[model samples]
Target chain A: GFSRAVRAVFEEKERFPGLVDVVSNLIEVDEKYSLAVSVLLGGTAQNIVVRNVDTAKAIVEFLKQNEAGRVTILPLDLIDGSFNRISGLENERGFVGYAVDLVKFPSDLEVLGGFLFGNSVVVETLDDAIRMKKKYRLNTRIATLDGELISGRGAITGGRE
Target chain B: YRGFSRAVRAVFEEKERFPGLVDVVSNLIEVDEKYSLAVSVLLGGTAQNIVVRNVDTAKAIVEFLKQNEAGRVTILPLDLIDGSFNRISGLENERGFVGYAVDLVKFPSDLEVLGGFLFGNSVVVETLDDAIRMKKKYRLNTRIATLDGELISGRGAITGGR
Candidate 1:
């Protein structure tokens, strides 16, 4: 359940490192939640964002004329947000918050936040992530602020990343 | 100013009351006087960590340590630790290699998991030069310890007397 949702997210992240780096440094989570909003939204945080289809074509035309690299443009008018939740993991000592809510962005980018992260849980440490993953038999989507994940049937993914 | 050992001393006082509480990791393993330094370097701070039967017993001991404010002790619940039991081939035949740290020491067979996790991949050598050479020549990704108490990490950071 949490697995596929986060998969799309880490997918989005990996697909854009080159573009994100080119966009000028920006942004920056807790443990139950994996996708930190600022990290995912870094400035335009992309599909070559534009306000309308016409604007997307406008940029596309400019790129072809200049022979600049091809880009994926998103007409913001056509996009929608994604959200999902599992309850009652917050009462514990180490609970941080849902990944979506922890993000601090300009009021303008609120849609980008909701469109990516759901109510994934965050914890204080990897041990806390381990405990939460063990305590909740089904949830393998826990994230540690240290970038450790207890995702995919409860295996830890952390170290140097 | 002190922790862990002091907390563990209280546990030792009532060893009979807790069957799961085993002695410290270092206390359980035996090596020659000359090899002690090598083992110490391999284990580092984990040398003083205590082992327990499982997580259940570990929690109770943690309660005792925390409630009593008896100082802090790191407990390695044997079942919780993963053991890959790394074996490097043809390393012993290298010149100046001493032995695998696990081979140079003795401990109970049942404690094999603990022993392997702590010392299995590490190799001991006759000198600091030997440690560096062994790591590069073998392309080793495990710790290397010297008889004179030097340690070279898999990534090639050397820790020894300056």
Candidate 2:
């Protein structure tokens, strides 16, 4: 899944000149466990999850058949191409905050995790940390653009850019 | 601040000229603006967009409710997702169609109308937490769109330009 996601990013990068890298990750659902498959592009990463193994593979096969190899083959594991991770007895500490079946809002669930506890911030995974940093960068860019526009429209400022 | 207060006072003094507009603007100022002006209004003291200066005044006014356990502070954080898909239907009728562009000229009236949609009647959410959430969601969507748009724009520019 990471490989396929990376391939998609590569295709995008090749099409765009001076394009900022876009990255994402894939999480796969084996029989009983799920693992995050991550890919990097331009030093950034993204995360997607394949909810069910058979279901994911079937969807991939459908895409392959319909699109004629335009889509890549997603492996069962997508990590090491193994199915043993699907064993029902394995408890990978992944289910601690899984809210796939819950009706809670995404914001509430995100806060419920170790990400934010009693007003303390905790980004457990490296991907989470990097994503948060990327968000800050993007926000700064937007604010700078907005300030420039506002200033150009006669809002008070000492110097012009 | 003087301009803002003068604007509010003009509304109250001339309340009969534009009843609804005057009332709404006055209420916004009274509830959100901190001043020595006299206006009797009580808002949810924990309102997200309460002006920074007015927050303490609002809290003071409504602190009795908190002391008596009569006030309920409910925060509704909304993440609005907008989606669009084009022209799956046929263009035989008006169901799906594209037309040529016309002459574009700027008019003050037209500008005001567009500004109404962009600014008027829109409530700005301003709690620290709510602001953070909005910033995150907006940035994420922008990143996704940037990736796609940059690729498309690059390819189009290269292929179309001499």
Candidate 3:
């Protein structure tokens, strides 16, 4: 799924030239385990994840050596299904809060859902995002895993009003 | 009476004779500008050709629709108008009038239209989350709007066959 998702991005990059970030998850449905990975390529590369420290470090170095900007690689462990390290990193990369069902991390969804940075948005399904936006009357923004943008009603900015 | 006039009346009278009937009228004058305006607003706010006054009125009507829907309205552009076809025909004509038309009965069923809007002929989802889902679903560009008004747009999947 990851490779196919990535392939789609390479093929359709021209459709949205302003695209700069991507968040993906590796989910083991039967096992009920998941690993979330976010790659930021806005003037630089930033990777956020839990575990896989060696891989994260290698990727960070690879990106940095390739002249990636403001690179930050965060690899934390899920302790009791939560991590203060992830929380700090999320706050550091603040926009609005995000929730994912890729993993059953305790309170992760709640944390993401309760995040009130601005107009809260669900960054997975467009339908669900729209539903949440309308349900909450929020000026939400929906982002696809491949990094496309969909603006909600009352959104003040972006290509689409 | 011309087809356009009859169609207009059909709509005004709320007659069920022509449900989902879309007709093209050759003589533009036969269709009342008010009806055109109404149709444009109901469809989603992109109207072309008629007169400037009609465009203004159509916009006003759209606003009214939005208000009536309690801000949960979605306006979609329609290619029914003559200008729409004409614009598409002209290869070099990048800029042209786009018209909107909506069916009143079907308009209220979905309020999620507020979460998305048309940008340069493409429907762009507002949040990063939705963009990703759309990208995955359609293999299309999933550009998302950031909180700062800038876009974090891009396309790429995690290769390796997940």
Candidate 4:
């Protein structure tokens, strides 16, 4: 409740933008795959993006000085972002594409992009995702255009409320 | 006539009240998720077939479908289908031989005979390679299928999916 000074740091639009803002503003995908991309991203979509621990420490220092509220920040260096392949099944039914390849970024942001997308997949439906997931023995995260998700461990989530 | 049928919705809805109703065969069976497609192909056209306790119940459902103009569905008259399992000599010892379809799937405890009747004499293995090998070696005439939905017949026919 107390971090107005720190909150103002987010207004520096050129340096920090919401993850979703970056996606919507610059990243592009075919209309059919948009819903899956939306679900694969977590609530960090609203958090600020930072490239290094240098900025990470600065953001914390600002919050500390201002007695401001806390937030889940995305400092690119720390997240698990190496992209993996979903091979052999590219010809599979309802197979859209992997989350990382679906988006584009400057070469410098490769780590940042890969961390968010990893080997997770986007497909036409939860039904289609499960079929391939089981048939191929895949352990990667899968998201459906219909707003369903299956984790790398095979748990189901993000269904209709 | 329907597996959880909308055409015969009232029958499924009333199944609890009527003891003679036994549900669609597929609904009454549970396969390992890993073995889903294999057992599904094993069940084949019978997946949606409804089962009844006896000939009387079978006629009752057939008349019900006729009167309601519900879409056609197969009915399994329990007493009519013999439940004996065909034998395959030394099949269990074969490499990649998982089990019979009836053995792999679960059903109500009292329904073993129905399971036997529906599954008939089907076999499942780990891969299409295993399915083909076993069919050729054993000269198997009954259905031999793989976990991923490939099938090889005793008569030397093959079917698979990508």
Superposed model 3: Cα runs more than 4 Å off: A1-25, A28-58, A62-74, A77-135, A141-161, B1-162
- Which residue pairs clash within candidate 2? A23-A46, A24-A46, A25-A46, A25-A47, A25-A48, A26-A48, A27-A48, A27-A49, A27-A50
What residue pairs are clashing in model 1?
Answer: A28-A39, A31-A122, A31-A123, A31-A143, A32-A121, A32-A122, A32-A123, A33-A121, A33-A122, B4-B72
By DockQ, rank the candidates, best first. Answer: 3, 1, 2, 4
Q: Where is the poorest 10-residue window by lDDT in model 1 chain B?
A: B153-162
- Quote the positional error of residue A139 for candidate 2 in Å: 13
**Tens digits of per-residue lDDT for model 4 on B68-162?**
65544556656544566776878898889999887888888776777777776899898988887888788888888898888766531111111
Stretches of candidate 4 off by over 4 Å are A1-161, B1-6, B13-19, B155-162
Taking candidate 1, what TM-score does its chain B reach relative to the real chain B?
A: 0.84
Q: Can you write out model 3's per-residue Cα lDDT over A6-47, one digit (the tens) per residue?
A: 334335445333332222232122221111112112211222
Higher-TM-score candidate of 3 and 4: 4
| DockQ (Cα-based) for each candidate | 0.03, 0.02, 0.03, 0.01
- Chain B TM-score (each prediction, in order): 0.84, 0.20, 0.20, 0.82
Candidate 1 runs further than 4 Å off: A1-161, B1-4, B155-162
Off by over 4 Å in 2: A1-112, A116-161, B1-52, B73-162
Superposed Cα deviation of residue A58, candidate 1 (Å): 48
Please give, for residues A1-161, the per-residue lDDT of candidate 1 as tens digits.
Answer: 22232223234443333222111112233333334333333233434434455554544454555443555544545556566655777776678876667754355555544554445566777567657655665342556665444442332333331
Angstrom error of the Cα, residue B138, model 1: value is: 2.7
